[PDB]
């Protein structure tokens, strides 16, 4: 199947910025603040003592290499008498994946629409909705702040909902595997919200998520930081103060670390075309593998006879279908030429 | 009938820009603001890994394709402790479709003048004025902001009016179909303004429209954006000393006039225009080969006068051609040639 000259979708998951608060004892809240401060380190660079080839430069003597290298960073920490930290944002799950946002070819629109209806019927939305929601219900969107913490707690507030807010107390102890989430009192009622949101022409499903981090005394917080003072935080205005925030696009990248179907999978990757790993600077699912999104999107006509048959599909060629569906929930421009 | 060398009308519906405000608890209002910020995404384009034909380009190895692509967007969101968002603008309905603004042919001016008087008598202005007024009274002019919201409300303030402002509370629940709008306490009195505006040589009918959006916590708002490295650049005005996003006047008028569901295989209503286009799937319904574009219906305008001046009920097929004929005169435009 050819790529058209116009093909684009909208995203089906819409997160927001994360706001950081300081809860004091006797329960008053205050927005967390930060300050820039200059520091002074050693002169480690391997470019100040060596050249490009690798022999020692003769200008950097032992006295000139112990001189003092001043830097300037932003610095954010928990105040002294504080109790814990609130972190609050919101997610929507809203059915944009059913038909393309823009598509000049009517044949490609019919083919893309059938796939979503075939996938919904033959495979179902249970596997993807479980994998997105297990990144909300633990501290995956709290990136490094989860690390080096006593405990953290997640409280959900789903909107088309009756009552009794959903709580996930003491992660790192109680919510480790997939089965620990399914043992919650109301887990099948929240998974079937995301399934109803994807399976309907107007599905809505808003969540209000709020966390509670119990850090050590006077400890660090790690917010997101700007693209360009060497470490500059991203910030908004709460009341009249500046306050560090976790970026909206940073938060959506944490909900979508699902991709563990690339051919030698150990660690789940953030969902993308030719899905990259930023730990080791490589692309798993390179176009030479044949298992990027554009080599699977061309096999969309072949995947229709697999799903419209009656034999259960091979697990190997439904991992290609989970990756096809996860890139349409992600959205993007799919043009060419 | 041939097209004259000069034919043009004025528009009969005049919207304005939509201004956004932030309402705080204790009911103080502040204009909504935005900022630009740079982000860092992956290197997805399909022109960075593939060539025009379809084989993989060989300069894009696995390391060079995992490198990092910085962009820059405008970013507008609801503040943290905010309650909701006001959205206010105004529409007028002003009878410019009664006569041509400019027409050098007196036979064509007479034919056009007769059609509006026979449409008004035989068919009436109830069908068009109900379709325009529904797009004001729900959040159609709030394009994507209606999506992903808790609820929204519309309050009308019509000008040649006695009192008691007209309210439409909790759309997506209370106002879904045509009959839900008709069950309002004063819906007929506002439809009979737009009818009286069209049915008169000096019809005026001003509406002051104000909305109230209950978004989630810290949520996104989607304003209109300029027709221009910044990737997303919003349209803006100045309220007090602060830039603030708008949702433009041309954009607002395109939302009131998404009415055209008379094209030959109609599913979704289109924006009213000549050879009515659909920008979702980039095609023209009502193409000149269909025979149901607006310049093929002008050439049968002498034919439509014998149908409307008979006594037999007009066929639905040839009065859905009259609704599209009337909706393009309310839209206005140069109708010349050559």
Coordinates of N, CA, C and O in Angstrom, one line a residue, chain B residues 45-197:
Chain B
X45 N 10.1 11.6 10.0 CA 9.4 12.3 8.9 C 9.1 11.4 7.7 O 8.3 11.9 6.9
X46 N 9.7 10.2 7.5 CA 9.7 9.3 6.4 C 10.4 9.9 5.2 O 10.5 9.2 4.2
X47 N 10.8 11.1 5.2 CA 11.7 11.7 4.2 C 13.1 11.7 4.8 O 14.1 12.1 4.1
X48 N 13.3 11.3 6.0 CA 14.6 11.3 6.7 C 15.2 9.8 6.7 O 16.4 9.7 7.0
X49 N 14.3 8.8 6.5 CA 14.8 7.5 6.4 C 14.5 6.8 5.1 O 15.2 5.8 4.8
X50 N 13.6 7.3 4.3 CA 13.3 6.8 3.0 C 13.4 7.8 1.9 O 13.4 9.0 2.2
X51 N 13.7 7.4 0.7 CA 13.7 8.3 -0.4 C 12.3 8.5 -1.1 O 11.3 8.0 -0.5
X52 N 12.3 9.1 -2.3 CA 11.0 9.3 -3.0 C 10.4 8.0 -3.4 O 9.2 7.7 -3.3
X53 N 11.3 7.0 -3.9 CA 10.8 5.8 -4.4 C 10.3 4.8 -3.3 O 9.2 4.3 -3.4
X54 N 11.1 4.6 -2.3 CA 10.7 3.7 -1.2 C 11.9 2.9 -0.6 O 11.7 2.1 0.3
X55 N 13.1 3.0 -1.2 CA 14.1 2.2 -0.6 C 14.8 3.0 0.5 O 14.8 4.3 0.4
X56 N 15.3 2.4 1.5 CA 15.9 3.2 2.6 C 17.2 3.9 2.2 O 18.1 3.3 1.6
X57 N 17.3 5.2 2.5 CA 18.5 6.0 2.3 C 19.6 5.5 3.2 O 19.3 5.1 4.4
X58 N 20.8 5.5 2.7 CA 21.9 4.8 3.4 C 22.7 5.8 4.3 O 23.6 5.3 5.0
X59 N 22.5 7.1 4.2 CA 23.2 8.0 5.1 C 22.5 8.0 6.5 O 23.1 8.5 7.4
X60 N 21.3 7.5 6.6 CA 20.5 7.5 7.8 C 20.7 6.1 8.5 O 19.9 5.2 8.3
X61 N 21.8 6.0 9.2 CA 22.1 4.8 10.0 C 21.2 4.8 11.2 O 20.5 5.7 11.5
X62 N 21.4 3.7 12.1 CA 20.7 3.6 13.3 C 21.1 4.7 14.4 O 20.3 5.0 15.3
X63 N 22.3 5.2 14.3 CA 22.8 6.2 15.2 C 22.4 7.6 14.7 O 22.0 8.5 15.5
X64 N 22.4 7.9 13.4 CA 22.1 9.2 12.9 C 20.6 9.4 12.9 O 20.2 10.6 12.7
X65 N 19.8 8.4 13.0 CA 18.3 8.5 13.0 C 17.8 8.5 14.5 O 16.6 8.5 14.6
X66 N 18.6 8.5 15.5 CA 18.3 8.5 16.9 C 18.9 9.7 17.5 O 19.3 9.7 18.7
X67 N 18.9 10.8 16.8 CA 19.8 11.9 17.2 C 19.1 13.0 18.0 O 19.6 13.5 19.0
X68 N 17.9 13.5 17.6 CA 17.2 14.5 18.3 C 16.8 15.7 17.5 O 17.7 16.4 17.0
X69 N 15.5 16.0 17.3 CA 15.0 17.0 16.4 C 14.3 18.1 17.2 O 13.2 17.9 17.7
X70 N 15.0 19.2 17.4 CA 14.3 20.3 18.2 C 13.4 21.1 17.3 O 13.6 21.5 16.2
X71 N 12.2 21.4 17.9 CA 11.2 22.2 17.3 C 10.9 23.4 18.2 O 11.5 23.6 19.2
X72 N 9.9 24.2 17.8 CA 9.4 25.3 18.7 C 7.9 25.5 18.4 O 7.5 25.6 17.2
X73 N 7.1 25.6 19.4 CA 5.7 25.7 19.3 C 5.2 26.8 20.2 O 5.9 27.2 21.2
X74 N 4.0 27.4 19.9 CA 3.3 28.2 20.9 C 2.5 27.2 21.8 O 2.0 26.2 21.3
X75 N 2.4 27.6 23.1 CA 1.8 26.6 24.0 C 0.9 27.4 25.0 O 1.4 28.3 25.7
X76 N -0.4 27.2 24.9 CA -1.4 27.8 25.7 C -2.1 26.8 26.6 O -2.5 25.8 26.0
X77 N -2.3 27.1 27.8 CA -3.0 26.2 28.7 C -3.7 27.0 29.8 O -3.5 28.2 30.0
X78 N -4.6 26.3 30.5 CA -5.4 26.9 31.6 C -4.5 27.0 32.8 O -3.8 26.0 33.1
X79 N -4.5 28.1 33.5 CA -3.7 28.1 34.8 C -4.2 27.2 35.8 O -5.3 26.6 35.7
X80 N -3.5 27.0 36.9 CA -3.7 25.9 37.8 C -4.9 26.2 38.7 O -5.9 25.3 38.7
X81 N -5.0 27.3 39.4 CA -6.2 27.4 40.3 C -7.4 28.1 39.6 O -8.2 28.6 40.3
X82 N -7.5 28.0 38.3 CA -8.5 28.6 37.6 C -9.8 27.8 37.7 O -9.8 26.6 38.0
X83 N -11.0 28.5 37.6 CA -12.3 27.9 37.7 C -12.7 27.4 36.3 O -13.0 26.2 36.1
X84 N -12.9 28.4 35.3 CA -13.3 28.0 34.0 C -12.8 29.1 33.0 O -11.8 29.8 33.4
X85 N -13.3 29.1 31.8 CA -12.9 30.0 30.8 C -14.1 30.7 30.1 O -15.0 30.0 29.7
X86 N -14.1 32.0 30.0 CA -15.1 32.8 29.2 C -14.6 32.9 27.8 O -13.4 33.0 27.5
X87 N -15.6 32.9 26.9 CA -15.3 33.1 25.5 C -16.5 34.0 24.9 O -17.6 33.5 25.0
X88 N -16.1 35.1 24.4 CA -17.2 36.1 24.0 C -16.9 36.7 22.6 O -15.7 36.9 22.3
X89 N -18.0 36.9 21.9 CA -17.9 37.5 20.5 C -19.3 38.0 20.2 O -20.2 38.0 21.1
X90 N -19.5 38.3 18.9 CA -20.8 38.9 18.5 C -21.1 38.6 17.1 O -20.2 38.6 16.2
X91 N -22.4 38.4 16.7 CA -22.8 38.1 15.4 C -23.9 39.1 15.0 O -24.7 39.5 15.9
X92 N -24.0 39.5 13.7 CA -25.1 40.3 13.2 C -25.7 39.5 12.0 O -25.1 38.8 11.3
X93 N -27.0 39.8 11.7 CA -27.7 39.3 10.6 C -28.4 40.4 9.9 O -29.4 41.0 10.4
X94 N -28.0 40.7 8.7 CA -28.2 42.1 8.2 C -28.7 42.3 6.8 O -28.5 43.3 6.2
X95 N -29.4 41.2 6.3 CA -30.2 41.3 5.0 C -29.4 41.9 3.8 O -30.0 42.7 3.1
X96 N -28.2 41.4 3.6 CA -27.5 42.0 2.4 C -27.7 41.1 1.2 O -27.3 41.4 0.1
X97 N -28.5 40.0 1.4 CA -28.8 39.0 0.3 C -30.0 39.4 -0.5 O -30.4 38.8 -1.5
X98 N -30.7 40.5 0.0 CA -32.0 41.0 -0.7 C -31.7 41.5 -2.1 O -32.5 41.2 -3.0
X99 N -30.6 42.2 -2.3 CA -30.3 42.8 -3.6 C -28.8 42.6 -3.9 O -28.0 42.4 -2.9
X100 N -28.3 42.5 -5.1 CA -26.9 42.5 -5.3 C -26.2 43.7 -5.0 O -26.7 44.8 -5.1
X101 N -24.9 43.6 -4.4 CA -24.1 44.7 -4.1 C -23.7 45.5 -5.4 O -23.5 46.7 -5.4
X102 N -23.5 44.7 -6.5 CA -23.0 45.3 -7.7 C -23.4 44.4 -8.9 O -23.1 43.2 -8.8
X103 N -24.1 44.9 -9.9 CA -24.6 44.1 -11.0 C -24.8 45.0 -12.2 O -25.8 45.8 -12.1
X104 N -24.0 44.9 -13.2 CA -24.2 45.8 -14.4 C -25.4 45.3 -15.3 O -25.7 46.1 -16.2
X105 N -25.9 44.1 -15.1 CA -27.0 43.7 -15.9 C -28.3 43.8 -15.2 O -28.4 43.3 -14.0
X106 N -29.3 44.5 -15.7 CA -30.6 44.7 -15.1 C -31.5 43.5 -15.1 O -32.4 43.4 -14.3
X107 N -31.3 42.6 -16.1 CA -32.1 41.4 -16.2 C -31.6 40.4 -15.1 O -32.5 39.7 -14.5
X108 N -30.3 40.3 -14.8 CA -29.8 39.4 -13.8 C -30.2 40.0 -12.4 O -30.4 39.2 -11.4
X109 N -30.2 41.3 -12.2 CA -30.5 41.9 -10.9 C -32.0 41.6 -10.6 O -32.3 41.2 -9.5
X110 N -32.9 41.7 -11.6 CA -34.3 41.4 -11.4 C -34.6 39.9 -11.1 O -35.4 39.7 -10.2
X111 N -33.9 39.0 -11.8 CA -34.0 37.6 -11.6 C -33.6 37.2 -10.1 O -34.3 36.5 -9.5
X112 N -32.5 37.8 -9.7 CA -31.9 37.5 -8.3 C -32.9 38.1 -7.3 O -33.1 37.4 -6.3
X113 N -33.4 39.3 -7.5 CA -34.3 40.0 -6.6 C -35.6 39.1 -6.4 O -36.1 38.9 -5.3
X114 N -36.1 38.6 -7.6 CA -37.4 37.8 -7.6 C -37.2 36.4 -6.8 O -38.1 36.0 -6.1
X115 N -36.0 35.8 -7.0 CA -35.7 34.5 -6.3 C -35.8 34.6 -4.8 O -36.3 33.7 -4.2
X116 N -35.3 35.7 -4.2 CA -35.3 35.9 -2.8 C -36.7 36.2 -2.3 O -37.1 35.7 -1.2
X117 N -37.5 36.8 -3.1 CA -38.9 37.0 -2.7 C -39.8 35.8 -2.9 O -40.7 35.6 -2.2
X118 N -39.4 34.9 -3.9 CA -40.2 33.7 -4.0 C -39.7 32.6 -3.0 O -40.5 31.7 -2.6
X119 N -38.4 32.6 -2.7 CA -38.0 31.7 -1.6 C -38.6 32.0 -0.3 O -39.0 31.1 0.4
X120 N -38.7 33.3 0.0 CA -39.2 33.7 1.3 C -40.7 33.4 1.4 O -41.2 33.1 2.5
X121 N -41.4 33.5 0.3 CA -42.9 33.3 0.3 C -43.2 31.8 0.3 O -44.0 31.3 1.1
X122 N -42.6 31.1 -0.6 CA -43.0 29.7 -0.9 C -42.3 28.7 0.2 O -43.0 27.8 0.7
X123 N -41.1 28.9 0.5 CA -40.3 28.0 1.4 C -40.2 28.7 2.8 O -40.5 28.0 3.8
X124 N -39.7 29.9 2.9 CA -39.6 30.6 4.1 C -38.2 30.5 4.7 O -37.4 29.6 4.3
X125 N -37.9 31.4 5.6 CA -36.5 31.4 6.2 C -36.4 30.6 7.5 O -35.4 30.9 8.2
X126 N -37.3 29.7 7.7 CA -37.2 28.9 9.0 C -36.1 27.9 8.9 O -35.4 27.7 9.9
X127 N -35.8 27.2 7.8 CA -34.9 26.2 7.7 C -33.4 26.7 7.8 O -32.6 26.1 8.5
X128 N -33.1 27.7 7.1 CA -31.7 28.3 7.2 C -31.5 28.9 8.5 O -30.4 28.7 9.1
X129 N -32.4 29.7 9.0 CA -32.2 30.4 10.3 C -32.1 29.5 11.5 O -31.5 29.8 12.5
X130 N -32.7 28.3 11.4 CA -32.5 27.3 12.4 C -31.1 26.7 12.3 O -30.5 26.4 13.3
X131 N -30.6 26.4 11.1 CA -29.3 25.8 10.9 C -28.2 26.8 11.3 O -27.1 26.3 11.8
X132 N -28.3 28.1 11.0 CA -27.3 29.0 11.5 C -27.3 29.2 13.0 O -26.2 29.2 13.6
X133 N -28.5 29.2 13.6 CA -28.6 29.5 15.0 C -28.2 28.4 15.9 O -27.8 28.6 17.0
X134 N -28.3 27.1 15.4 CA -27.8 26.0 16.2 C -26.3 26.0 16.3 O -25.8 25.6 17.3
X135 N -25.5 26.5 15.3 CA -24.1 26.6 15.4 C -23.6 27.7 16.4 O -22.5 27.6 16.9
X136 N -24.4 28.7 16.6 CA -24.1 29.6 17.7 C -24.5 29.0 19.0 O -23.7 29.0 20.0
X137 N -25.6 28.4 19.1 CA -26.2 28.0 20.4 C -25.6 26.7 21.0 O -25.8 26.4 22.2
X138 N -24.8 26.0 20.2 CA -23.9 25.0 20.8 C -22.5 25.5 20.6 O -22.2 26.5 20.0
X139 N -21.5 24.7 21.0 CA -20.1 25.2 20.9 C -19.5 24.8 19.6 O -18.4 24.3 19.6
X140 N -20.1 25.1 18.4 CA -19.5 24.8 17.1 C -18.4 25.8 16.8 O -17.3 25.4 16.3
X141 N -18.5 27.1 17.2 CA -17.5 28.1 17.1 C -16.4 28.0 18.1 O -15.4 28.7 18.0
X142 N -16.5 27.0 19.1 CA -15.4 26.6 19.9 C -14.9 25.3 19.3 O -15.4 24.2 19.7
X143 N -14.0 25.3 18.4 CA -13.7 24.2 17.5 C -13.3 22.9 18.2 O -14.0 22.0 18.2
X144 N -12.1 22.9 18.8 CA -11.6 21.7 19.4 C -11.6 21.8 20.9 O -11.3 20.8 21.6
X145 N -12.0 22.9 21.5 CA -12.0 23.2 22.9 C -13.2 22.5 23.5 O -13.2 22.2 24.7
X146 N -14.3 22.4 22.7 CA -15.5 21.6 23.1 C -15.1 20.2 23.4 O -15.6 19.6 24.4
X147 N -14.3 19.6 22.6 CA -13.8 18.3 22.8 C -12.9 18.3 24.1 O -12.3 19.3 24.4
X148 N -12.9 17.2 24.8 CA -12.2 17.0 26.0 C -12.5 18.0 27.1 O -11.6 18.5 27.9
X149 N -13.8 18.3 27.3 CA -14.2 19.2 28.3 C -15.3 18.5 29.2 O -16.0 17.6 28.8
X150 N -15.4 19.0 30.4 CA -16.5 18.5 31.3 C -17.9 18.9 30.8 O -18.7 18.1 30.5
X151 N -18.1 20.2 30.8 CA -19.4 20.7 30.2 C -19.1 22.1 29.7 O -18.0 22.7 30.0
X152 N -20.0 22.6 28.9 CA -19.9 24.0 28.4 C -21.3 24.6 28.3 O -22.3 23.9 28.2
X153 N -21.4 25.9 28.5 CA -22.7 26.7 28.5 C -22.6 27.8 27.5 O -21.5 28.3 27.3
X154 N -23.8 28.2 27.0 CA -23.9 29.3 26.1 C -24.9 30.3 26.6 O -26.0 29.8 27.0
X155 N -24.6 31.5 26.7 CA -25.6 32.6 27.0 C -25.7 33.6 25.9 O -24.7 34.2 25.5
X156 N -26.9 33.8 25.4 CA -27.2 34.7 24.3 C -27.7 36.0 24.9 O -28.3 36.1 25.9
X157 N -27.3 37.1 24.2 CA -27.9 38.4 24.6 C -28.3 39.2 23.3 O -27.5 39.9 22.7
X158 N -29.5 38.9 22.8 CA -30.0 39.6 21.6 C -30.3 41.0 21.8 O -30.7 41.5 22.8
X159 N -30.1 41.8 20.7 CA -30.3 43.2 21.0 C -31.7 43.7 20.8 O -32.2 44.3 21.8
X160 N -32.4 43.6 19.7 CA -33.8 44.2 19.8 C -34.7 43.3 20.5 O -35.6 42.6 20.0
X161 N -34.6 43.3 21.9 CA -35.1 42.2 22.7 C -35.5 42.9 24.0 O -34.9 43.8 24.5
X162 N -36.5 42.3 24.7 CA -37.1 42.8 25.9 C -36.2 42.6 27.1 O -35.7 43.5 27.7
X163 N -35.9 41.3 27.5 CA -35.1 41.0 28.6 C -34.9 39.5 28.8 O -35.4 38.7 27.9
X164 N -34.3 39.2 29.9 CA -34.1 37.8 30.4 C -33.3 37.0 29.4 O -33.9 36.3 28.6
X165 N -32.0 37.2 29.4 CA -31.0 36.5 28.6 C -31.2 35.0 28.4 O -31.6 34.4 29.4
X166 N -31.0 34.6 27.2 CA -31.3 33.2 26.8 C -30.0 32.3 27.2 O -28.9 32.7 26.8
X167 N -30.3 31.2 27.9 CA -29.2 30.4 28.3 C -29.4 28.9 27.8 O -30.5 28.4 27.6
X168 N -28.2 28.3 27.5 CA -28.1 26.9 27.1 C -27.2 26.2 27.9 O -26.0 26.1 27.7
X169 N -27.7 25.6 29.0 CA -26.8 25.0 30.0 C -26.5 23.5 29.7 O -27.5 22.8 29.3
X170 N -25.3 23.1 29.9 CA -24.8 21.7 29.8 C -25.1 21.1 28.5 O -25.9 20.1 28.4
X171 N -24.6 21.6 27.4 CA -24.5 20.9 26.2 C -23.6 19.7 26.3 O -22.8 19.7 27.2
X172 N -23.8 18.7 25.4 CA -23.4 17.3 25.4 C -24.4 16.5 26.2 O -24.4 15.3 26.1
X173 N -25.2 17.1 27.0 CA -26.2 16.4 27.8 C -27.6 16.9 27.4 O -28.5 16.0 27.1
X174 N -27.9 18.2 27.4 CA -29.2 18.7 27.2 C -29.6 19.1 25.8 O -30.8 19.2 25.5
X175 N -28.6 19.4 25.0 CA -28.9 19.9 23.6 C -28.1 19.1 22.6 O -27.0 19.4 22.2
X176 N -28.8 18.0 22.2 CA -28.2 17.1 21.2 C -28.9 17.1 19.8 O -28.2 17.2 18.8
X177 N -30.2 17.1 19.8 CA -30.9 17.1 18.5 C -31.6 18.5 18.3 O -31.4 19.4 19.0
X178 N -32.4 18.5 17.2 CA -33.1 19.7 16.9 C -34.2 20.0 17.9 O -34.5 21.1 18.2
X179 N -34.9 18.9 18.3 CA -36.0 19.1 19.2 C -35.6 19.5 20.6 O -36.4 20.2 21.3
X180 N -34.3 19.3 21.0 CA -33.9 19.8 22.3 C -33.7 21.3 22.3 O -34.0 22.0 23.3
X181 N -33.3 21.9 21.2 CA -33.3 23.4 21.0 C -34.7 23.9 21.0 O -34.9 25.0 21.6
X182 N -35.6 23.3 20.4 CA -37.0 23.8 20.3 C -37.7 23.7 21.6 O -38.7 24.5 21.7
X183 N -37.3 22.9 22.5 CA -38.0 22.8 23.8 C -37.5 23.9 24.8 O -37.9 23.9 25.9
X184 N -36.6 24.8 24.3 CA -36.2 25.9 25.1 C -37.3 26.9 25.2 O -38.2 27.0 24.4
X185 N -37.3 27.7 26.3 CA -38.5 28.5 26.7 C -38.6 29.6 25.6 O -39.7 30.0 25.3
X186 N -37.5 30.2 25.2 CA -37.5 31.2 24.1 C -36.5 30.7 23.1 O -35.3 31.1 23.1
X187 N -37.0 29.9 22.1 CA -36.3 29.6 20.9 C -37.0 30.1 19.7 O -36.3 30.5 18.7
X188 N -38.3 30.2 19.7 CA -39.0 30.7 18.6 C -38.8 32.2 18.5 O -38.8 32.7 17.3
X189 N -38.7 32.9 19.6 CA -38.5 34.4 19.5 C -37.2 34.8 19.0 O -37.0 35.9 18.5
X190 N -36.2 33.9 19.0 CA -34.9 34.2 18.5 C -34.7 33.7 17.0 O -34.1 34.4 16.2
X191 N -35.4 32.6 16.6 CA -35.5 32.3 15.2 C -36.3 33.3 14.5 O -36.0 33.7 13.3
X192 N -37.3 33.9 15.1 CA -38.1 35.0 14.5 C -37.4 36.3 14.5 O -38.0 37.3 14.0
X193 N -36.2 36.4 15.0 CA -35.3 37.6 14.8 C -34.6 37.4 13.5 O -34.5 38.4 12.7
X194 N -34.0 36.3 13.3 CA -33.2 36.0 12.1 C -34.1 36.0 10.9 O -33.6 36.3 9.8
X195 N -35.3 35.5 11.0 CA -36.3 35.5 9.9 C -36.6 37.0 9.6 O -36.6 37.4 8.4
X196 N -36.9 37.8 10.6 CA -37.3 39.2 10.4 C -36.1 40.0 9.9 O -36.3 40.9 9.1
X197 N -34.9 39.6 10.3 CA -33.7 40.3 9.7 C -33.6 40.0 8.2 O -33.4 40.9 7.5

